[PDB]
Design a protein around this ligand. Structure first.
Ligand SMILES: Nc1ncnc2c1ncn2[C@@H]1O[C@H](CO)[C@@H](O)[C@H]1O
Ligand SMILES: Nc1ncnc2c1ncn2[C@@H]1O[C@H](CO)[C@@H](O)[C@H]1O
Ligand SMILES: Nc1ncnc2c1ncn2[C@@H]1O[C@H](CO)[C@@H](O)[C@H]1O
Lengths: 621, 298, 621, 318
């Protein structure tokens, strides 16, 4: 249930050690590819001419074992950032040697340490190896939660441990990593191996690692408190951290000697089994974590059958649609008018008939008379509709194969029902679709939904920022991938400020010269130090009175699978200090053919205006 | 054992004149270590011409004598080992193998009484051991980086030097509630106490400079590479022998001026040991499997 | 063992039909997505306003069944290329409707017919659908081996079947397909569903389909000759064709009614089992068919351990290397000099020691004294070498970690042995490597190999031409993918002329001012009508006297896995008529840093010079 | 090209400075008592269309000592101009050599090697490699002119130049490559945010044990103003002989010297710098047997990406 590995600096017999490690219960071994104490010379004689083999042989293990069980380790004497010139030059050649020796064996990952503020030459040498040869290896940077200088025992008479509280100073190891990956151009091959210490730092320091590519978690044996029966366990503060890392599916690493004279691995498995069972949304979205998809345009495109099927497999949203119609029937037709009044219900954008069926179920429980119309422009869905109307519905449902904005209806409607909302509410163009169907609504008719509002919250996710970069394509703008929204189940991320409302649409629209174009400015108070990469978009909708749907995390309709958050990215990440406000601007723009969004950050610093005039992204009308 | 691995780490002459040898294979299929005794020092390193021999599970990073019978060993396994010579001095038997360091034990030093010791490790910790009870009395994380060297005081059992890659040299004294004290450039690599002045010591850095330090300073550019060791002669007015990664040996006077210069070695010069019998004799082992004997011009 | 499907034009009950078809033994069903007789109107009233459902519902099958078992079919009345304007306009809207209905269901493939010379508008309408929406569907064009006009019974008094032999005229159906895919820009989504007829055409007509993307083979029941026990079988000429299609792994389709009143499917399975067992090369290369790989550059790059391992798992090449050394020892050291003479054997480019071991095995069987040197520049392989020299070899093998062109050898050699050959012989730069090691060869020394020659043969493969197009990358020349060789196990292809020798290298080189640059002109007589897409490159080498290695298909060393042919492509395909000669020119060019090839076709028409000055491809010195 | 050599020859200041450097080296090597007994072996490595050879001649007439010239040149087109000069005017004194100075097997060793192999960032035309390859044929007491050169760097703000570097995007390459390569430019609409500091230094001849031409330098620039950093102006200084020097460092510029303009090392993203902050840059000089390149990253007030890693955007051909 947990992918785990053992970290060692002593492997006398590579095959014996691996056998013992696997028998212990591990899945991989972190061992040095050269003897850790074997300092080598590459410049001056006669140590440079050192004869004999330089390390053990590749033949000692099969290609599968080298590719699946061995995570290499950089030799501890390799100091590319030394103040001594000879040590730097020596360590440069020495570093390339071990990386190229690990590439030679096809090792799945290779560990390099970050234990000081200046790792410029370390980064240079790594960047240069990444651009040399036919690679694939992952590079895990071993970086501690707390610097070893900030966790030393206060036992130096003339150098006491500074007892002052430094909020930003406590987060020095994150800047070690931040600066290192900036130098290396956010290479998708450089990930974090976060070293957990004896006493956990302040929660802000821990929160600094949210949205970072943590691939491994290093738990040293010395952090395990021994229990009553003499077995290793962890504090409830440490346990909570383990539970946060289990969501990111990191590989647990156990380093150091046995101090409970395995049990550490068994304790991790016990913890893994004692986590809450995943809810419906959680079990559905598994697989889609941080996977960027294109937002659907059901107006411009005809949705596939298998797509309509998944939108129909959302019971919560259809039970909420039914009860909204149920309440509107009662509030419109009093019990004395029970059979004298027939309500004209038009399902605009009917799909393969799930709203039409909900409209029917809502008439049986509200016991009122309804006359249905199922308008739909996708002719393929219309086939499913016309076969439903023949086999079950009959004269009650009048199938209309047209665009709701073109349709010349026979009579006006009492209730127009629709499911035209995207993850950013108005992104599938409901404001234009229901505006075009407003003339055939009674001067007292009800639209379901009657209101919808989009939300935005600033986020940090170098994992998602890196994923948006990967979306560069040929024959287009090299930066277009940053000027378009993405539907994504955000997961390895940090939300830097609570969602605020963005754009609001109401139906029907009685405003004199309404206009669907928008411009909104939002100010986000940021309580932490961070790097802004994008803006999560969410939505809320009022179907009827207290019957609502929501994808805003704090008011999420439980068990509602039908939507994932949208992601509005920015070309360049923006450093934000604690206390600073992130000021974003969003526009909803349009012409007779297209609808698009534009957005710019104006604080703490300006960004470029993203998607000016829909050059990267438009929604088709 | 039928062979001793090419990487000779430690050379220590005892009171009568026997030679202790620590060695490891820092390359090849197997990365293990070995302890050897040479009653005939001129025979070394001949595996067949030895008096006693043993093989340890992991490499020998450092060692020291525990009187004339026992040997204290700092292993790559993270354990501190104790190996005592038998009644005939032909077999080497293990007494304790205690894994207390979470990483390679890099340096070892026996404290004045002879019943206590200090281990310095790459795991950043320093440990004070009771050899008789076979347990650690105290654990000190005073350094920030790997511990390079620990040098127990010639005459004070609670005093010992330490130096680490964190650029710190610490003067210890277990009697104080904050026992370390920062004394002071380039990283400290080797620590040697003066055998006649319990207030003076020498330290060698990674830039090849050796320096003279009085607890309450003088410097010289000896080597072109990191100073691996500093060892004083048994003389009443000692000579200082400085080992190095530039494969050379130098013997300096009181004012750090060079007298001897030996290029005999073709790989890293690891350890040095002056003869208890002939004070003009210095023995230097290295990573080139040599056990070179030197005649210092006195 | 054979992927097969049933073709039908009558599916009264879609679920019943599928059940019967699967119970019969099929894997998929080709059925119409609309009723074949249901002509629809899209322009004039009142047939355009035809009410009711337009076809059966998507709900009748699960998404998996629609995606894995249903191959759609275009309605037989859809004639986009009609001479009648109204029928063309009607069929345009009608064609898009059925393609979009099949895209809606996510069908794995959709059949469209080619049964006339002019399918321009058919192609236009298909090309326009391919650029409309979010696709993935395969389009199989049903095209007959023999046109139905050329297989009619000679029963028309005033229109007799022309009894004259027309070589090119018999290949009219291939030009129907050729012109159709040219119009559609060689879309990787358009494949051939080749219809096999009652009497097979001439073999040249059949050969015309080599190198074409045949995804399905349509066997109609009427082509099965009934045997003694009353079961359907095929002629030995038809059986041979089935065996050629089984190499291309096509999906067999059975169309038409049961005339042996399944058995047809069982006969196909019997045929599949009666094919020859695949040899070592055949079973090894399976998976690599027409997969383009980059040619290795062991000089410029350090080969990985798992790569050296596969080059060592070729017994034939090492037994041939051993016997070449075995014969050279005997021919150099007479039995009277048995222990007086020690030969200086230098394995230049030793790798992980397989040639050194072969050199040892060759001294035990030739019973002569040898002194070995294992030169190698890749330091990672040198680790494996130095561990071999310690554990087994000893003083006999002197490991040298250097480039053979830099090495200052202690004494001269009697025999230099090397394995520096690529699929085009000199493409790993052996001519430069052994030239640099020639000074330290005795004035009477033997090089193994002593000679190597590259070969070239022109080829047709629209499958491989399409695969090279797919290799376009951003940040480079949009056409660079056509100016570089590829190592590939050529499979779906046609070789238009037998291999001819190209470049020849000899070792040692006693020519006054030798020069490794080359220029060769080859004339290839073409006996068939075809489309040239590239030139297969092969090689032959003389290790010692009659001990040779070869990848030339007609002289291939059996069981030799170590190399696959190279492919030298051309930017634009070239039509070649029967009787025409394909004249190619090849250059081997160089400077002090790089070595490259250039090539141009000069007949029947000129091509552009490919890779001028190594702008797309160089080999690093 | 010929018209290019012509403009490099139309710089009187640099040739009068080259002459006086040879003038002083002749006197400091050949005493008046050895006036006609000593002939100095002067080799103009990289002779071009003969302007240094003529300066070497003018320097022998005014220093009144005997010289034996060698005009080494690899460009065969310039060699045509050289061989026509040697025929029409020079004669037996000048021995034209059509070869690469790193290949040439000279007849005898030289007393003085003279060269003009410097770029705007001093070592950017690869003088360190060219004169290293010609060092074996120098006398164990020979003088190289120039004997030393040092590059300089100063951080700059110029949205005009930053915009000009963006405009250099080209198809079929990295969309950002235009920011990972130096440019020779007469900087004008700009602000220099800190005074030039020395970067890389080369000396000739090179007696260091295992010399190595690869470099790594870290410079800290104190910034007294609020600004936006777009690049680093590169400049150079060279010691021909003793007090005879050439310079393009603005504060020590050799007057009337047209032969060079500053180099511009840009950065992909501009960096905000507040008053009091230090701009910390790192520069590397990297190489292999075929190419030489630079890499550079800003590490304060914020990090930048490493520019030109492994010469992916820009290399200098060896
Ligand atoms: N303007 C429109 N007219 C009619 N149906 C529409 C319109 N826009 C979207 N739909 C349909 O509404 C459903 C919900 O997105 C889909 O089936 C879509 O095809
Ligand atoms: N010039 C060279 N010098 C030494 N070994 C070489 C040279 N070129 C290729 N090799 C080695 O020869 C083997 C066969 O390609 C490989 O192991 C390769 O690395
Ligand atoms: N390595 C070289 N060998 C000879 N001449 C050179 C070399 N490099 C540059 N030059 C020449 O030196 C002059 C100054 O750049 C030019 O004429 C150039 O062509």
């Amino acid at each position: 249930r947990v992918s785990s590995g053992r970290d060692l600096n002593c492997v006398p017999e590579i095959a014996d050690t691996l056998g013992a490690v696997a028998k212990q219960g591990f899945d991989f071994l972190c061992m040095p590819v050269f003897h850790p104490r074997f300092k080598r010379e590459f410049i001056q004689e006669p140590a440079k001419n050192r004869p004999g083999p330089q390390t053990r042989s590749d033949l000692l293990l099969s290609g599968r074992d080298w590719n699946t069980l061995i995570v290499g380790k950089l030799s501890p004497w390799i100091r590319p950032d030394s103040k001594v010139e000879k040590i730097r030059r020596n360590s440069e050649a020495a570093m390339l040697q071990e990386l190229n020796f690990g590439a030679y064996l096809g090792l799945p990952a290779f560990l390099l340490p970050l234990n000081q503020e200046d790792n410029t030459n370390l980064a240079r040498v790594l960047t240069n190896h990444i651009h040399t040869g036919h690679h694939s290896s992952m590079f895990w940077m071993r970086v501690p939660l707390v610097a070893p200088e900030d966790l030393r025992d206060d036992i130096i008479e003339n150098a006491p441990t500074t007892h002052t509280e430094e909020y930003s100073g406590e987060e020095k190891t994150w800047m070690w990593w931040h600066n290192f990956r900036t130098l290396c151009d956010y290479s998708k091959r450089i990930a974090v191996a976060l070293e957990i210490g004896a006493d956990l730092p302040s929660n802000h320091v821990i929160d600094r690692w949210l949205g970072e590519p943590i691939k491994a978690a290093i738990l040293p044996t010395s952090i395990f408190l021994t229990n009553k029966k003499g077995f290793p366990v962890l504090s409830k503060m440490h346990q909570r951290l383990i539970f946060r890392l289990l969501k990111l599916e990191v590989q647990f690493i156990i380093t150091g000697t046995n101090h409970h004279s395995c049990s550490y691995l068994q304790y991790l498995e016990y913890l893994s089994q004692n986590r809450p069972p995943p809810n419906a949304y959680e079990l559905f979205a598994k697989g889609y974590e941080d996977y960027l998809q294109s937002p659907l345009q059901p107006l411009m495109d005809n949705l596939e059958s298998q797509t309509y099927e998944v939108f129909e497999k959302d019971p919560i949203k259809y039970s909420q649609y039914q009860q909204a119609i149920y309440k509107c029937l009662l509030d419109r037709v009093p019990e004395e008018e029970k059979d004298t009044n027939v309500q004209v219900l038009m399902v605009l954008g009917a799909g393969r008939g799930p709203l039409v069926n909900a409209s029917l179920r809502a008439a049986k429980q509200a016991d009122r008379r309804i006359k249905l119309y199922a308008v739909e422009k996708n002719p393929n869905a219309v086939v499913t509709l016309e076969n439903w109307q023949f086999e079950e519905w009959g004269s009650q449902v009048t199938v209309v194969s047209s665009d709701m904005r073109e349709w010349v209806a026979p009579e006006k409607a009492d209730i127009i029902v629709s499911e035209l909302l995207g993850s950013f509410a108005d992104n599938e163009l409901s404001p234009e679709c229901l505006d075009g169907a407003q003339h055939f609504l009674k001067d007292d008719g009800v639209s379901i939904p009657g209101e919808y509002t989009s939300f935005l919250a600033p986020i940090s996710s170098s994992k998602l920022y890196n994923e948006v970069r990967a979306c560069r394509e040929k024959d287009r703008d090299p930066e277009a991938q940053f000027e378009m929204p993405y539907v994504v189940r955000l997961h390895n991320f940090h939300q830097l400020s609570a969602p605020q409302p963005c754009f609001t649409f109401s139906h029907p629209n009685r405003d004199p010269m309404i206009d669907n174009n928008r411009y909104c400015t939002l100010e986000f108070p940021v309580e932490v130090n961070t790097v802004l990469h994008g803006f999560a978009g969410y939505f809320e909708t009022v179907l009827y009175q207290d019957i609502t749907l929501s994808i805003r995390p704090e008011t999420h309709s439980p068990g509602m699978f039908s939507w994932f958050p949208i992601l509005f990215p920015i070309k360049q990440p923006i450093t934000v200090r604690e206390g600073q406000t992130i000021c974003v601007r969003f526009w909803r723009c349009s012409n007779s053919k297209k609808v698009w969004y534009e957005w710019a950050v104006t604080a703490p610093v300006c960004s470029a205006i993203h998607n000016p005039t829909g050059r990267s992204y438009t929604i088709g009308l | 054992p039928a062979c001793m691995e090419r990487q000779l780490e430690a050379a220590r002459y005892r009171s009568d004149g026997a030679l202790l040898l620590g060695a490891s294979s820092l390359s090849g299929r197997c990365w293990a270590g070995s302890l050897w005794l040479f009653k005939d020092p001129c025979a070394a390193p001949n595996e067949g011409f030895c008096s006693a021999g043993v093989q340890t599970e992991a490499g020998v990073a450092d060692l020291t004598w525990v009187g004339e019978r026992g040997i204290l060993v700092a292993s790559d396994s993270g354990a501190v080992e104790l190996w005592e010579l038998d009644e005939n001095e032909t077999l080497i038997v293990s007494k304790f193998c205690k894994y207390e360091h979470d990483d390679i034990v890099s340096t070892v030093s026996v404290l004045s009484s002879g019943t206590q010791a200090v281990s310095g490790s790459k795991d950043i910790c320093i440990k004070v051991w009771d050899l008789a009870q076979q347990v650690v009395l105290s654990s000190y994380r005073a350094h920030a980086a790997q511990v390079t060297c620990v040098a127990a005081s010639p005459h004070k059992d609670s005093v010992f030097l330490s130096c680490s890659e964190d650029n710190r040299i610490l003067l210890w004294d277990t009697r104080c509630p904050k026992p370390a004290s920062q004394i002071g450039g380039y990283l400290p690599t080797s620590l040697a106490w003066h055998p006649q002045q319990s207030e003076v010591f020498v330290f060698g850095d990674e830039n090849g400079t050796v320096s003279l330090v009085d607890t309450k300073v003088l410097s010289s550019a000896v080597h072109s590479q990191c100073v691996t060791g500093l060892v004083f002669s048994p003389h009443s007015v000692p000579f200082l022998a400085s080992l190095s990664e530039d494969c050379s040996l130098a013997v300096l006077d009181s004012s750090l001026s060079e007298l001897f210069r030996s290029q005999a070695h073709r790989d890293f010069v690891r350890d040095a040991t002056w003869s208890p019998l002939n004070h003009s004799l210095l023995t230097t082992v290295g990573w080139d499997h040599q056990v070179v004997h030197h005649v210092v011009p006195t």
